[PDB]
Design a protein around this motif. Structure first.
Motif, mmCIF file in Angstrom:
data_model
loop_
_atom_site.group_PDB
_atom_site.id
_atom_site.type_symbol
_atom_site.label_atom_id
_atom_site.label_comp_id
_atom_site.label_asym_id
_atom_site.label_seq_id
_atom_site.Cartn_x
_atom_site.Cartn_y
_atom_site.Cartn_z
ATOM 1 N N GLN A 93 0.786 -1.229 0.000
ATOM 2 C CA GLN A 93 0.000 0.000 0.000
ATOM 3 C C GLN A 93 0.822 1.285 0.000
ATOM 4 N N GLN A 94 1.846 1.363 0.843
ATOM 5 C CA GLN A 94 2.663 2.573 0.879
ATOM 6 C C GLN A 94 3.345 2.851 -0.463
ATOM 7 N N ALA A 95 3.899 1.815 -1.088
ATOM 8 C CA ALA A 95 4.579 1.991 -2.373
ATOM 9 C C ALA A 95 3.566 2.350 -3.449
ATOM 10 N N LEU A 96 2.401 1.723 -3.392
ATOM 11 C CA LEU A 96 1.359 2.011 -4.362
ATOM 12 C C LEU A 96 1.051 3.499 -4.274
ATOM 13 N N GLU A 97 0.877 3.984 -3.051
ATOM 14 C CA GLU A 97 0.550 5.386 -2.842
ATOM 15 C C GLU A 97 1.611 6.375 -3.311
ATOM 16 N N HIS A 98 2.887 6.128 -3.035
ATOM 17 C CA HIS A 98 3.861 7.093 -3.511
ATOM 18 C C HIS A 98 4.111 6.949 -5.012
ATOM 19 N N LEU A 99 3.786 5.789 -5.580
ATOM 20 C CA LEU A 99 3.939 5.612 -7.026
ATOM 21 C C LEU A 99 2.849 6.452 -7.689
ATOM 22 N N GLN A 100 1.633 6.355 -7.162
ATOM 23 C CA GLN A 100 0.518 7.106 -7.723
ATOM 24 C C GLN A 100 0.644 8.604 -7.446
ATOM 25 N N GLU A 101 1.267 8.949 -6.328
ATOM 26 C CA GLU A 101 1.462 10.352 -5.993
ATOM 27 C C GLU A 101 2.394 10.945 -7.048
ATOM 28 N N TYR A 102 3.501 10.259 -7.298
ATOM 29 C CA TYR A 102 4.469 10.710 -8.290
ATOM 30 C C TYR A 102 3.841 10.807 -9.684
ATOM 31 N N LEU A 103 3.198 9.732 -10.132
ATOM 32 C CA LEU A 103 2.573 9.724 -11.454
ATOM 33 C C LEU A 103 1.431 10.727 -11.524
ATOM 34 N N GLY A 104 0.786 10.958 -10.387
ATOM 35 C CA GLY A 104 -0.326 11.889 -10.337
ATOM 36 C C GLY A 104 0.055 13.334 -10.609
ATOM 37 N N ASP A 105 1.346 13.647 -10.538
ATOM 38 C CA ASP A 105 1.822 15.003 -10.787
ATOM 39 C C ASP A 105 2.194 15.264 -12.240
ATOM 40 N N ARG A 106 2.125 14.226 -13.069
ATOM 41 C CA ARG A 106 2.440 14.346 -14.491
ATOM 42 C C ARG A 106 1.522 13.415 -15.286
ATOM 43 N N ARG A 107 0.264 13.348 -14.862
ATOM 44 C CA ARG A 107 -0.733 12.484 -15.479
ATOM 45 C C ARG A 107 -0.799 12.571 -17.001
ATOM 46 N N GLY A 108 -0.615 13.769 -17.546
ATOM 47 C CA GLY A 108 -0.686 13.939 -18.986
ATOM 48 C C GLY A 108 0.522 13.498 -19.790
ATOM 49 N N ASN A 109 1.586 13.065 -19.121
ATOM 50 C CA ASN A 109 2.783 12.634 -19.838
ATOM 51 C C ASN A 109 2.871 11.148 -20.166
ATOM 52 N N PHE A 110 1.909 10.355 -19.714
ATOM 53 C CA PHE A 110 1.960 8.928 -20.004
ATOM 54 C C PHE A 110 0.586 8.298 -20.176
ATOM 55 N N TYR A 111 0.558 7.166 -20.871
ATOM 56 C CA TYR A 111 -0.674 6.413 -21.046
ATOM 57 C C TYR A 111 -0.502 5.284 -20.052
ATOM 58 N N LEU A 112 -1.566 4.939 -19.348
ATOM 59 C CA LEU A 112 -1.478 3.876 -18.371
ATOM 60 C C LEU A 112 -2.429 2.747 -18.713
ATOM 61 N N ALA A 113 -1.924 1.523 -18.638
ATOM 62 C CA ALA A 113 -2.741 0.352 -18.908
ATOM 63 C C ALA A 113 -2.449 -0.719 -17.866
ATOM 64 N N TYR A 114 -3.508 -1.293 -17.312
ATOM 65 C CA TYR A 114 -3.363 -2.363 -16.344
ATOM 66 C C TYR A 114 -3.563 -3.644 -17.142
ATOM 67 N N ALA A 115 -2.546 -4.503 -17.155
ATOM 68 C CA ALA A 115 -2.601 -5.784 -17.861
ATOM 69 C C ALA A 115 -2.693 -6.815 -16.749
ATOM 70 N N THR A 116 -3.916 -7.222 -16.440
ATOM 71 C CA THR A 116 -4.157 -8.143 -15.345
ATOM 72 C C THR A 116 -4.802 -9.457 -15.751
ATOM 73 N N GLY A 117 -4.666 -10.454 -14.884
ATOM 74 C CA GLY A 117 -5.258 -11.752 -15.143
ATOM 75 C C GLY A 117 -6.712 -11.716 -14.726
ATOM 76 N N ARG A 118 -7.070 -10.691 -13.962
ATOM 77 C CA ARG A 118 -8.434 -10.526 -13.488
ATOM 78 C C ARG A 118 -9.389 -10.103 -14.598
ATOM 79 N N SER A 119 -10.663 -10.434 -14.422
ATOM 80 C CA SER A 119 -11.683 -10.036 -15.376
ATOM 81 C C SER A 119 -11.832 -8.538 -15.139
ATOM 82 N N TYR A 120 -12.532 -7.853 -16.035
ATOM 83 C CA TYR A 120 -12.749 -6.417 -15.906
ATOM 84 C C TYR A 120 -13.458 -6.074 -14.594
ATOM 85 N N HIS A 121 -14.540 -6.791 -14.298
ATOM 86 C CA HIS A 121 -15.310 -6.560 -13.077
ATOM 87 C C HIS A 121 -14.420 -6.710 -11.848
ATOM 88 N N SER A 122 -13.631 -7.778 -11.823
ATOM 89 C CA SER A 122 -12.739 -8.028 -10.702
ATOM 90 C C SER A 122 -11.685 -6.923 -10.605
#
Ligand SMILES: OC[C@H]1O[C@@](CO)(O[C@H]2O[C@H](CO)[C@@H](O)[C@H](O)[C@H]2O)[C@@H](O)[C@@H]1O
Ligand SMILES: [Mg+2]
Ligand SMILES: [Mg+2]
Length: 244
Positions: free
Chosen positions: A18-47
């Motif tokens: 959780q802590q790493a997730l938060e500072h990763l998102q905090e950092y990326l959250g300050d330059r949201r327009g500079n990257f495209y983000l995609a989650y490639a997961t084994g989970r279904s969309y709903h999950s």
């Protein structure tokens, strides 16, 4: 048109610390327009969506779900990708074969979809059975691939799916170069990602199959992170000097 295409698995990669997730998102959250983000997961969309509410995942631009068997754009499910994967795919025949293996037990229905047949490998069984299954399935002539991860999860997918193939499709769709792409993973169902020519990071807490893969096919573009979970993603971003 952005400088980075960030593709990452969720469980045990982006999620887990959780802590790493938060500072990763905090950092990326300050330059949201500079990257495209995609989650490639084994989970279904709903999950995947339920997980987002549980740990507060930042909104991605794309969802490559069920190991890349379904792609979701901000506007919705990609029907072109669906039709593309349906070509030559014969789910029923492959399931009949897989169902015949005593060492395999079907995964819950909600884990299945038209282009994904999943099972659980008996923890008491010999992992070598996956090789026999793969050979038997391949010899049907049906374009299929077998994804084995965490020593127990088995997914049957069209040869045209992977997190890797879904990723190359997205790259072409966004006109993003491999040199501008960073794939992040932790297990066997992420191998397809590292098979692409994109830059990649293997989290410290990676599963055995992924590390073993790295030992044999690891190359210059693959980075073995010291940090685990989301921390590995920040580490990789600095390593490949992305988001300069
Ligand atoms: O990501 C690892 C973790 O995700 C779960 C969530 O249920 O499984 C997902 O990924 C598997 C590998 O592709 C799929 O077979 C499964 O159907 C999917 O839900 C956990 O089982 C797994 O440990
Ligand atoms: Mg995972
Ligand atoms: Mg994984």
């Amino acid at each position: 048109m952005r400088q980075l295409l960030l593709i990452s698995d969720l469980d045990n990669t982006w999620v887990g610390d959780q802590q790493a997730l938060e500072h990763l998102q905090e950092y990326l959250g300050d330059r949201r327009g500079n990257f495209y983000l995609a989650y490639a997961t084994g989970r279904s969309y709903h999950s995947a969506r339920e997980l987002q509410k549980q740990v507060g995942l930042m909104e991605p631009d794309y969802w490559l779900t069920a190991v890349g068997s379904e792609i979701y754009h901000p506007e919705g499910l990609d029907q072109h990708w669906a039709d593309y994967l349906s070509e030559h795919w014969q789910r029923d025949i492959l399931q009949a074969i897989a169902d015949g293996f005593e060492a395999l037990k079907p995964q819950s229905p909600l884990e299945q979809n038209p282009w994904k047949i999943s099972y659980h490998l008996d923890p008491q069984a010999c992992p070598t059975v996956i090789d026999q299954l793969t050979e038997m399935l391949k010899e049907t002539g049906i374009p299929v691939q077998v994804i084995f991860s965490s020593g127990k999860d088995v997914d049957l997918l069209p040869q045209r799916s992977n997190k890797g193939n879904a990723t190359q499709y997205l790259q072409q769709h966004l006109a993003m170069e491999p040199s501008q792409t960073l794939v992040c993973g932790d297990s066997g169902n992420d191998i397809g990602l590292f098979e692409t020519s994109a830059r990649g990071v293997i989290v410290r807490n990676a599963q055995p199959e992924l590390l073993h893969w790295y030992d044999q096919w690891g190359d210059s573009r693959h980075y073995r992170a010291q940090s685990s979970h989301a921390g590995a993603i920040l580490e990789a971003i600095a390593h490949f000097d992305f988001l300069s």
